[PDB]
Symmetry: C2
Subunit: 260 residues, 2 copies
């Protein structure tokens, strides 16, 4: 046994077609896990993640699912266990962002956000509990906006992640009967190819700055004076899902480089 | 002007057909508000609340709504403003409880709980923002289970209220443009005619105790050695919706008599 490593373990990672999830999938592979690369949309993109994990010396398979549809979450987990024999780790990076003043939020937008961010993640945890081996790991995605950062016109999303924080604390109670720990990660400002399209929403008069100015401002929000990156989230997920992370259970870790 | 009083104000209170909401409606009437007694089911029950408010010297009307249906929330608020001329205060006591291990939670049960506790309350806040007079008040209902109390087999409900806590913090930002404050109350153990049917869920081996034993145990959870009552919640709501409560804004107040 090599400490911190996941040799002999099997991990499922959702949201592997965007920056953070892709980095989490590759990192769990690098640590020695075989990986089910779950994704929502681009099969070519997901297969690039599979290829990267194989190149590192670990096995991976891409399995698609619409995480809004609970029957598809059931099938995803069944197929994961059928392919690799068992499953030890489930990480959800599933979610969508949303902005708008309360006054303008529609039924459709509420449902768009909660169906994935909150309901989808709840049922990913349910199916992970049902399928996981004893002593496994579940990690869901919250946000620094749930509790630690207050963004005007971001009530819907912030609440979708506030629910996740409460879920994980109580899931840890129920999941203890299979010795499964349950935690959430709550990233701050993380730079990906989608960051620049929404970064104006997170600062007053955001549109009056250039994208580069907004990224620099985001960097200066951490006392370390750098941006957060997908690898920062992956690094913490890797610890939580290791043997050495066991005593962190039922918690939400805000990953913002000290900004809050 | 009498300090603490709501003379000349108009308040809408949802969930007026159960213990806490009924007590909040009567109390706002006692403080001088005219009250829209909104309720989900029994018209005879709601009219008893109306009658009690009238007997106290304040006007009231019962207006029914299915708070799960956003078009009905819209109509409720339109009708409130049409009847009394304006609306200053909106208090939601809308919600349902739910219990069960994560492993057994169904799609239907998830939707039953979130549609009212989280989605319904979100849109009560939206319609209150849209209809309220400048300087008004919105109060939603969270729970001590959101953050302050961890009950096994209560993940769904706990998360439905964790979302509300995040909502109110951000709603306070958006609603400030009409000088409306937004807060939540998070009651603990509150005795009503429905308490005894669920009190076993809240203590280990709950069913092995009598209802009276369970109520006494609940009482001893507060260092004051009494149960919480609907009037305790009403008292705090009355402060939050008064002029003197203005500087409490964007907050969730846990009302458990010091148990946490
Ligand atoms: Cl994806
Ligand atoms: Cl997804
Ligand atoms: Cl009611
Ligand atoms: Cl209701």
């Amino acid at each position: 046994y090599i400490p911190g490593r996941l040799d002999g373990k099997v991990a499922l990672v959702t949201g592997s077609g965007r920056g953070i999830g892709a980095a989490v999938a590759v990192h769990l592979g690098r640590l020695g896990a075989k990986v089910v690369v779950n994704y929502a949309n681009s099969t070519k993109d997901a297969e690039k993640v599979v290829s990267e994990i194989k190149a590192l010396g670990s096995d991976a398979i891409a399995i698609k699912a619409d995480i809004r549809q609970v029957p598809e979450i059931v099938k995803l987990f069944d197929q994961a266990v059928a392919h690799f024999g068992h499953l030890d780790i489930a990480v959800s990076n599933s979610g969508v962002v949303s902005f708008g003043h309360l006054k303008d939020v529609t039924e459709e937008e509420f449902d768009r956000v909660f169906s994935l961010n909150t309901r989808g993640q709840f049922f990913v945890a349910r199916e992970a509990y049902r399928h996981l081996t004893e002593g496994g790991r579940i990690v869901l995605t919250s946000s620094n906006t749930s509790k630690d950062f207050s963004v005007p016109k971001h009530s819907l999303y912030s609440g979708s992640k506030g629910a996740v924080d409460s879920f994980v604390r109580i899931f840890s109670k129920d999941c203890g009967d299979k010795k499964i720990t349950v935690n959430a990660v709550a990233p701050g400002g993380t730079v990906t190819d989608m960051f620049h399209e929404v970064s104006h929403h997170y600062i007053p008069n955001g549109t009056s700055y250039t994208a580069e100015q907004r990224q620099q401002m985001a960097a200066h929000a951490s006392p370390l004076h750098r941006n957060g990156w997908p690898q920062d989230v992956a690094n913490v997920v890797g610890f939580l899902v290791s043997k050495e992370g066991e005593w962190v259970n039922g918690k939400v870790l805000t990953l913002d480089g000290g900004a809050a």
